[PDB]
Design a protein around this motif. Structure first.
Motif, PDB file in Angstrom:
ATOM      1  N   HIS A 198       0.823  -0.984  -0.022  1.00 13.82           N
ATOM      2  CA  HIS A 198       0.058   0.001  -0.057  1.00 13.82           C
ATOM      3  C   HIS A 198       0.922   1.096   0.067  1.00 13.82           C
ATOM      4  CE1 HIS A 198      -3.311  -2.604   0.363  1.00 13.82           C
ATOM      5  NE2 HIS A 198      -3.317  -2.558   1.682  1.00 13.82           N
ATOM      6  N   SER A 199       0.125   2.436   0.179  1.00 18.23           N
ATOM      7  CA  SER A 199       0.830   3.536   0.202  1.00 18.23           C
ATOM      8  C   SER A 199       1.263   4.141   1.545  1.00 18.23           C
ATOM      9  CB  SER A 199       0.001   4.595  -0.460  1.00 18.23           C
ATOM     10  OG  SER A 199      -1.227   4.679  -0.155  1.00 18.23           O
ATOM     11  N   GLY A 200       2.296   4.944   1.687  1.00 19.04           N
ATOM     12  CA  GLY A 200       2.696   5.378   3.000  1.00 19.04           C
ATOM     13  C   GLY A 200       2.229   6.783   3.461  1.00 19.04           C
ATOM     14  N   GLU A 201       1.914   7.458   2.232  1.00 18.61           N
ATOM     15  CA  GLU A 201       1.487   8.893   2.476  1.00 18.61           C
ATOM     16  C   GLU A 201       0.184   8.796   1.624  1.00 18.61           C
ATOM     17  OE1 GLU A 201       5.174   9.286   1.781  1.00 18.61           O
ATOM     18  OE2 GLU A 201       4.231   7.667   0.667  1.00 18.61           O
ATOM     19  N   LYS A 202      -0.993   9.296   2.185  1.00 19.94           N
ATOM     20  CA  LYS A 202      -2.410   9.621   1.497  1.00 19.94           C
ATOM     21  C   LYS A 202      -2.884  10.970   1.891  1.00 19.94           C
ATOM     22  CE  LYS A 202      -4.836   6.091   0.522  1.00 19.94           C
ATOM     23  NZ  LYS A 202      -5.661   4.844   0.677  1.00 19.94           N
ATOM     24  N   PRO A 203      -2.110  11.995   1.500  1.00 17.75           N
ATOM     25  CA  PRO A 203      -2.584  13.367   1.776  1.00 17.75           C
ATOM     26  C   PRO A 203      -4.104  13.589   0.966  1.00 17.75           C
ATOM     27  CG  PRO A 203      -0.887  13.370   0.313  1.00 17.75           C
ATOM     28  CD  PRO A 203      -1.217  12.142   0.613  1.00 17.75           C
TER      29      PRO A 203
END
Ligand SMILES: [Zn+2]
Length: 48
Positions: free
Chosen positions: A35-40
Motif C-alpha cells: 500500500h501507500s505510505g502517505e495519503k494526503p
C-alpha cells in the motif's frame, strides 16, 4: 438496545485499505509495503 456483556474481542489486526486479516502489527508492517505510505487528502480544501 443491547446487553453489553459478551462479544468479539479485538486481539488481531485487520487491514481496511484492502480488507484482510492478520495476526499482529508485525505482519501488517510488511503488508503496508504493498500500500501507500502517505495519503494526503489534497482533494478537499477547507471552507466556512
Ligand atoms: Zn492491505
Amino acid at each position: 438496545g443491547s446487553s453489553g456483556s459478551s462479544g468479539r474481542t479485538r486481539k488481531q489486526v485487520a487491514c481496511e485499505i484492502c480488507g484482510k486479516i492478520f495476526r499482529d502489527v508485525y505482519h501488517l508492517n510488511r503488508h503496508k509495503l504493498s500500500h501507500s505510505g502517505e495519503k494526503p487528502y489534497s482533494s478537499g480544501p477547507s471552507s466556512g
